[PDB]
Design a protein around this nucleic acid. Sequence first.
RNA 1: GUAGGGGAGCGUUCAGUCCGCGGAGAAGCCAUACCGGAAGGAGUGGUGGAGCCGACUGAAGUGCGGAUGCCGGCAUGAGUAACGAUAAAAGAAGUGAGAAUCUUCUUCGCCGUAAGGACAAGGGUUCCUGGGGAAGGGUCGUCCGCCCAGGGAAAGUCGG
RNA 2: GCGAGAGCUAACUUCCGUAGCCGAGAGGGAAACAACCCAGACCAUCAGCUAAGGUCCCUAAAUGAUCGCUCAGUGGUUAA
RNA 3: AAAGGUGAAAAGAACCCCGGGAGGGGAGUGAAAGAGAACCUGAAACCGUGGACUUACAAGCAGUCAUGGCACCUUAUGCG
Lengths: 127, 58, 113, 117
Amino acid sequence: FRNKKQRKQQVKLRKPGFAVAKYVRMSPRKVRLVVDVIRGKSVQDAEDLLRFIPRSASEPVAKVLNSAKANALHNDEMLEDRLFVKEAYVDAGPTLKRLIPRARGSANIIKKRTSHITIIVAEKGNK
Amino acid sequence: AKHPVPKKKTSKSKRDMRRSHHALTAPNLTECPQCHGKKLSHHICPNCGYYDGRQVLA
Amino acid sequence: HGKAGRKLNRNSSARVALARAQATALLREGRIQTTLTKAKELRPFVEQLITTAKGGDLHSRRLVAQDIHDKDVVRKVMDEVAPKYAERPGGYTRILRVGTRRGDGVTMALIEL
Amino acid sequence: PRAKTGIVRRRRHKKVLKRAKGFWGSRSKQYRNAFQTLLNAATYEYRDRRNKKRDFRRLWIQRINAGARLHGMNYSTFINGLKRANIDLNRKVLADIAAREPEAFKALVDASRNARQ
RNA sequence: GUAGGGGAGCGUUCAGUCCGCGGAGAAGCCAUACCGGAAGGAGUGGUGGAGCCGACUGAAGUGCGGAUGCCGGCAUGAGUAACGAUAAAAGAAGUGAGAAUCUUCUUCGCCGUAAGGACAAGGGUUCCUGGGGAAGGGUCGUCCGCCCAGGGAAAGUCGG
RNA sequence: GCGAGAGCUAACUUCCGUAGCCGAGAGGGAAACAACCCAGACCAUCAGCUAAGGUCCCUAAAUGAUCGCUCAGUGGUUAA
RNA sequence: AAAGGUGAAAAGAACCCCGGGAGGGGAGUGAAAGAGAACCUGAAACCGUGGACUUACAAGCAGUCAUGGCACCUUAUGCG
Ligand SMILES: [Mg+2]
Ligand SMILES: [Mg+2]
């Protein structure tokens, strides 16, 4: 224990099987669709389903998924063939407001959103 | 003007009762008989180019 | 209804200039990848063309020359390919479908002689 | 000297906001609405005490005679009877006696007929 | 008990004074089943990382849901309508981390008193070469009229 | 409501007199319902007696007692 | 017009992992990265992931009073 301040130093705080693509120029709502088929499974499948799934959000999710893997494995010395998407999700980063002209003088703002795709891989096992 | 227009903001809920139908169906991948990588039934294996023999270039 | 029997997505001449354009490429290169559907359009048309070529008389050449405006390609179908299919009951052209595409999600495919 | 509202308002708000719990949607997440819901809330709260008193005696009277009539009496009668016997004077718990102790309840039943006709 | 009058108080900042508190940790934030007749107050834990409670008195830009209020942020409509002339496009080949969308070739189609060419005005470097790949380009882009660097413009008689 | 005019002794009509309530009045009753009826809410209570209204079931309480009336469903939309 | 704030001091992240990059994970500096340069605090609306209790004969200002079921019990097992 000690007290907060000593803890901060006795510990460093880490993130097992975790990666995160911050600021992917896509709509969270759009990416979620893909991140959703991949939630909770054989990180192999995830690799596989992405290769085929038609949505263009797939690349980024791909990249984050193979980065979270290249961590669980390296910085975490994990056993890859027991790895599975423990958790994944999409949060919205800033928003690229941009102005668009409209009929008869009026104007409009197109919201070009963006997303933080983060995915957490973890060794499975039954027991 | 913009003639029809909505009477009220829709619940975060209502707005979701809606989307209860937009969930992608994951492809039904098969495993290629040769290089064993997964493929799409009735198409050529993008990894070996086979479809019994090798159709597409390496 | 609409129980007809054919395809367009262009006017009346475009749909004819395409089928002619693909007919020619297919014959000039033995194989071409194309949108899945377009190959479907192409297939029968081309087979017919190989069968018209498959006569050797000037008439049959002159007819083919109506849908193959490239002198070199007509000679090929006329003298190299039509003669070769002599013994098969007009039935050769096959379509293989490949993966979906990126720019528009459209699944491409192969139509080969 | 200037004198913001700082922290003074957030709090006033959290107070109400936190009163609303299983308050459905907006009503439990938006100040204005949540708050407003609590005015009607006043109306019910206050008036419901002066009122569950009304509701409860009803539950009591209902049972008191589904036992009363279980012998051949009925609340109306039965009650005036125990009444006829200043002796008897429960009324409060009477139902319960009629719900749990049948042995007893009978007693009081017949006790009234025996002070009735 | 509405307009209205009268009474007692809660809270916010600033100021004077008292008691103090704080890096083993202030203010602010966050959670809570305690306390007070209310306004409100406290305890404990988490966050935080430096100033700060309580009490008496004094001064106030002192308390908010309303004003088609003001500024800002984020929602709904909804992944909907649109992607800006119905002059079409096809294949091959090349480059590339990735291309329907770039480059090359070969065809197709559209303009041809023009959708060709030369100036003016107006704009300025937009020109050329090599790079680039955020944002702009209603979609891709390895490309661009976009970003970076370098280069380019030459008059005794053309205009002044 | 009662007393008058105005008005077709029309109007949730209009203008005065006068009482009451709403307005500034919650509670029970009248299906629902400002003002009609009974009643004026200092706070608490799983306690009690009543008002007006009610006591087949939907809701609390006699499908009570005695002597009658109408067969119409009168009851639960008017007259010569 | 709007626009402030790394840390005491740059000691501003050598080297390795996935990525074209952006981004991130380790390592290392630092009291602290539960300060990393879209860097003091970081409320609320608003989006999302996981968990608990629920929901597919139902007419709903969205609560309130009452009871039962389920879960949990740091001002809190006897009341919640
Ligand atoms: Mg407002
Ligand atoms: Mg008459």
